[PDB]
Amino acid sequence: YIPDYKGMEPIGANIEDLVDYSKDWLSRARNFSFFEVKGTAVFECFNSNEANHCQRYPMSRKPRNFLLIQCSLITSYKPATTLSDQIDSRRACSYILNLIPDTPASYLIHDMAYRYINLTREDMINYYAPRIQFKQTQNVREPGTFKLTSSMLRAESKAMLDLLNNQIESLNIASHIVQSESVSLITKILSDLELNITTVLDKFFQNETQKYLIDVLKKTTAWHIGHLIRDITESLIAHSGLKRSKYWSLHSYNNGNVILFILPSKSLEVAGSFIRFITVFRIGPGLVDKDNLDTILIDGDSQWGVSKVMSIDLNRLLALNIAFEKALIATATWFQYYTEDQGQFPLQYAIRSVFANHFLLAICQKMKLCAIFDNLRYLIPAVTSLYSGFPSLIEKLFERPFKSSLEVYIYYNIKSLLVALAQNNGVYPSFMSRIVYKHYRSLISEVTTCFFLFEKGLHGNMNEEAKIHLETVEWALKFREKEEKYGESLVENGYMMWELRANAELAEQQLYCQDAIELAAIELNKVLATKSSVVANSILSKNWEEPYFSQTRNISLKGMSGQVQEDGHLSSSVTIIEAIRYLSNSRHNPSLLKLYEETREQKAMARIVRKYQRTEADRGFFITTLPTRCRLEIIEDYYDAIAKNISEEYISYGGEKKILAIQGALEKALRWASGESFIELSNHKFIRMKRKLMYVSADATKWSPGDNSAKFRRFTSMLHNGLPNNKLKNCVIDALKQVYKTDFFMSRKLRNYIDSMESLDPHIKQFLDFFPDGHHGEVKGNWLQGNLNKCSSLFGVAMSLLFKQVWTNLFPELDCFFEFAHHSDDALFIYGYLEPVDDGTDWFLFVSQQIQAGHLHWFSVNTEMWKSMFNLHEHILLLGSIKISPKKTTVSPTNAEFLSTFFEGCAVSIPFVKILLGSLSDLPGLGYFDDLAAAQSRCVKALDLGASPQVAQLAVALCTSKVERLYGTAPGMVNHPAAYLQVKHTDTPIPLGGNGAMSIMELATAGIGMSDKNLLKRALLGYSHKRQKSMLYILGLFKFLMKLSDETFQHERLGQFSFIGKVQWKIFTPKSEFEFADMYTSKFLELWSSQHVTYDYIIPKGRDNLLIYLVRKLNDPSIVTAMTMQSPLQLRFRMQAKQHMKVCRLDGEWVTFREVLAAANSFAENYSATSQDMDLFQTLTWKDFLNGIHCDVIPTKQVQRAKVARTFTVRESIPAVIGYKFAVTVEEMSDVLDTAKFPDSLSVDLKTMKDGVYRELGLDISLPDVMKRIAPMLYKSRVVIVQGNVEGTAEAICRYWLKSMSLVKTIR
RNA sequence: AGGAGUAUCCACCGCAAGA
RNA sequence: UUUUGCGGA
RNA sequence: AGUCUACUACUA
RNA sequence: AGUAGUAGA
RNA sequence: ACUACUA
Ligand SMILES: [Mg+2]
Secondary structure, eight states: OOOOOOOOOOOOOOHHHHHHHHHHHHHSOOOOSSEEOOHHHHHHHHHHHHHHHTTTSOEESSOBOOOSSOEEOSSOOOOOOHHHHHHHHHHHHHHHTSSOOOSHHHHHHHHHHHHHHTOOHHHHHHTTOOGGGOOOOSSOOBTTBBOOOGGGSOHHHHHHHHHHHOOOOEEOTTSHHHHHHHHHHHHHHHHHHHSBOOOHHHHHHIIIIIIIIITTTTTBHHHHHHHHHHHHHHHHHHHOSTTTTTSBEEEEETTTTEEEEEOOOOOTTSSSOEEEEEEEEESOSEEOOGGGEEEEEEETTEEEEEEOOEEEEHHHHHHHHTHHHHHHHHHHHHHHHHHHHHSSOOOHHHHHHHHHHHHHHHHOOOHHHHHHHHHHHHHHHHHHSSEEOHHHHHHHHTSSOOOBHHHHHHHHHHHHHHHHHHHOOOOEEOSSSSOEESOHHHHHHHHHHHHHTSOTTOSOTTHHHHHHHHHHHHHHHHHHHHHHHHTTTTTTTOBOHHHHHHHSSOSSTTOBBHHHHHHHHHHHHHHHTTSHHHHHHHHHHSSSSSBTTOSHHHHSSSEEEEEEOTTSSEEEEEHHHHHHHHHHTOSSOOBHHHHHHHTSSSOEEEEEEEOOOSSSSOOEEEEEBHHHHHHHHHHHHHHHHHHTTOTTBOTTSOTTHHHHHHHHHHHHHHHHHSSEEEEEOTTOOEEEEEEEEEEEEEOBTTSSTTOOTHHHHHHHTTSOOSOSSSHHHHHHHHHHHHTSEEEEEOOHHHHHHHTTOSSOOHHHHHHHHHOSSSSEEEEESOOOTTTTHHHHHHHHHHHHHHHHHHHHHHOSSSOOOEEEEESSSOEEEEEEEEEESSSOHHHHHHHHHHHHHTOGGGTTTSSOHHHHHHHHHHHHHHHBTOOBOSSSOEEESSEEEETTEEEETTEEEOOTHHHHHHTTSOOOTTOHHHHHHHHHHTTHHHHHHTOOHHHHHHHHHHHHHHHHHHHSOSTTSSSOHHHHSSSOSTTSOGGGTOOOOOOHHIIIIIOSTHHHHHHHHHHHHIIIIIOOHHHHHHHHHHHHHHHHHTOOOOBTTBSSOOOSOOOEEOOOOOOOOSGGGSSSOHHHHHHHHHHOGGGGTSOOOSHHHHHHHHHHHHTOHHHHHHTSOOOHHHHHHHHHHTTTSSOEEETTEEEOHHHHHHHHHHHHHHOOOOSSHHHHHHHTOXOHHHHTOOOOEEEEEOOOOOEEEEEEOOOOOTTTHHHHHSOOSHHHHHHHHHHSSSGGGHHHHHHHHHHHHHHHTOOOTTSHHHHHHHHHHHHOOEEEEEETTOOSSHHHHHHHHHHTSSSSEEEO
16 A cells, blocks of 8 residues: 655746756856866966965974884895794894983883893793693783883883873975975885895796796895784784783894884774884884984994884784785786786886885875875876866865875875876876876776775774764755755755746755756656656566565664664664564564655654775765665665666666676767768758767766755656556655755764863864754755665766757757766766867858857857866756766866776776775684685686786785685694695695685686585596595595584485585674564574574565564574674684684584694595495586686787676576475465565476486485575676677686786787 | 874773882 | 782773 | 675675 | 675765 | 794
């Protein structure tokens, strides 16, 4: 039953009125929103901003720090070993007890070194001892720490403690003294970092990346200093645990030259913590800025630079731990981009310099530098394009205090690069090296690489927790000023065309023209009414009568907001928690429409929370309560069903199929430009006009904040759908009316922050005055970011189509190709303008005749008519309250940017660096296989977006190395299988500490799971043809794995579970600490799950069962883990605990991975072939193409061309038929028919499961336990960036990858 | 002494004894 | 308010 | 630490 | 289907 | 929660 709500009634809008208004608008002269990019213009902007910047911030004489960890290296760095640490620590204490301290941060260092050196032999055993092999000492109370009482500190040493436990300024960048001294300092640091310290791919990578990047880089001090900072950060991470951070610690590296004195500090496990330490080092080539050193002690002409007490956040500490890995990935990406750009291998100097710059950026994890880089990814598109908002973007570049010599150096390099880029409008000077590029894609990829070298969240704890609110507040106030000025009815119901003509200031953001909105809906209807039947089928497909809280979105773990608490703030709860609350407080499971009926009068409460980004300004997103979610879900379902049917709307596309859609749009764009347009004169003369394209990489200034939800109300009421009634349309209009006003709550952090201030600044006072109650405030028309993405995107497409119709009406003589692609706010406008093919004596005469006849709008179309189209569009969109951004919107004849992917003509390029640098993120500590599979599969995505197979293989190697280093499993560590097993590392099953198929092409095409099967087959052949001991040992290892699994295939093919082998780690998952977890006793959940086995695969559609199902979900250990607010260190500690601690299940007891490996070795030594286990192996046994392929290296330089995106069908409802298999009850049957897309043929797809399993594994899935095991394997098309010549089939992509194994060489 | 900043923030919590 | 000793984050 | 759009792994 | 990771708006 | 042969 769809309710009867108010339906808005047509205004009778006529395109004639809008085309007449557009004629009047284009008749006059319009100031272009953008400025032409000229070298003189950019240089003058830089000079004027330099002159003005001296007054912005108080002058700074002393530059602040830029290096989080300072250290120097003169000899090759051997990475730390426990023996080397203790030898180097003793040597370093002997070194630095000779020096004479002067500063308190030198006396503390000397007094901690003297304490450490006075630790007994027993102290040195527990020191550097694993936690399981550690004892209390009364001087070494933790594995890597030692006590240091104040009783053991000099008078000045305790003064350093007093400073720690007891006014923004900018360097004068206008002066040449600072721009010389700061650049000279970094040029000395970078040059020191550049100093040299005294499968098919495995071969190709060895000759290409290793000989030309990882080897060239291997000798530099940047490489060894990166290893030294890995070991420093490993010590700091080891010191940041809850119990180890209370005490001090001394560690040393590079034969005692580098010493790390980790002071007591708050454990990084808890938030708002910093790992305070002092690093002392002999002054030499490296990350040293002697102006920012605490001391430089002298002894025998030797300089010992004592660094300041550097407090480092957990995010920054983990950044510095992967600083070498991030720098190496960035340099490999730059290396590949250089190879594609110039066709030549980068020179040694260029690679060393770019690695030094990348490593300095990875070390200097500063939000100031991160912000400047964030502005440079906007500045480079601005100063490269034809017209852009480069003056305003450069103004943004100077709205920052340059407080450190790196920011001054980075700014100076930015200024030089931007001025040089504006000279040409190919050639593209590099930001990190001297070599100039040829493709803008390489430069933009380079600067995005620099930007992504800064980890997300490098912002202030509360400085940027407040800044998210102000951006929302002002537009919630600008709306109020707009409402007061225009009457609160013009703003909400919308102004008419005659009002706009009378005022002409109404064409402003947050104000929408009613006639324009209706006409945009009409132009969208011109497409919709063609497929009205499909539109109606799509709308009624959505979950309108299907129950709420049965869709995964309404029961997910994503946070939502509850109600206003007694404190007055908005309660921060989980989506599932609110689902369970409403289900408990209701006697039935409501549908979407019924829940909207019951929850339409509540207000759309909301709360904003920071999405921890790397942007200069953190973009916090809103969290909506349950009624707001149901309103927005009604609107988004309606406008996703409607939007899926039109092609110029892109948020409705699927993932990377948006890239294919925009690629096809651009292909048709240059297809139209491939021609000469003809204008028909009264004499019938055909003026020939050269068709040209202008790509506007449009960005919307404050799309969600500063818009009007009300524009959609007249949109929905006029957007036609094939539905007979207007019942659903009226419901959607009502929902849009209910999302007009929002209760914007500021976070508890911000409220306590403001409530902990002695005085309130005037701008803070203005910000707080927005909320009338201390916490709540009113937001009008500003639909929260991302909540109406579908609806707003479709509205933008409609307004662009309306402008297209208006332009067609205005100039029917000119055939102009028009292609708009709105995703949500990012948009790409291709405007086809007919430039006069000659000097234009005819064209100018024709335009003059048109103007004289009465078409005054033709003044606009003579010179550069694309400007006229963009102006008219920027206006039409403004009539729909859409402001194309003056800055971050760039027009260009050739280059375009959409969805953070850069197009050049027919070519596309997505920067895969983000995937590669993001592949070094946290891991699931499930186990060694789960962690190795996650690490190795994160780079396959990059291989798809453009990554070179080597650069992806190198990333896989780095990820695998990190994962091993957290799990032993490294050669010469503790859990290395080769120590206890009798096979090589490559010939070891992944569960038993195996690297597996490290090759990316196997992981890209086959999968990680197939490495165990690929091993089994590789064993089976060895035990089927040669009958050697190695493959028999491998089979014994696999059989031991199955013995651990305790699953039984019994008679060949006729058993209980399907297995390949696994190991069971001691996963400690606590009990749920949430409100709706004790409602039903866990025993009741046990009986309920054992009876209703169908619901393990389909969400129940009845409130009575759904309550029990959701209570069970709250008690799921994985779900409990996902909602306990853990930290990335406790995760790292948990992975590392699987090195020495009793974390593995062997037999019936918990043993270490050492003992599991030993038991596996014993079993595989004693294993004997039963001729039935071989039958099991045959069943358990895309890789055919990979093992049967070969390539020939032609002596010719590899050619590079346009890159496109193509689909990839690697493998040929899946989770609901199993529910029908166990469907025993009437309610379960109803739920399984509701969940199934086509319930009629359920058994038809069940018989395929019976036949498919019997064909492959020969198992009787009719048994309950058997079917549950085959479900995970039953459940298991991507989109890749290839070259233009490559075909869109599965094998062609692999052929291209094989051809791309080399980088400067050719492969046939 | 750091991190963050033309938004006041983080940089350790409790206990018992002694000065 | 400093320290010492004991625990927790 | 949200909404969509996905991709990749891993788990019943 | 659930989690983890990543990317885009 | 570490310190291996560290891609
Ligand atoms: Mg854009």
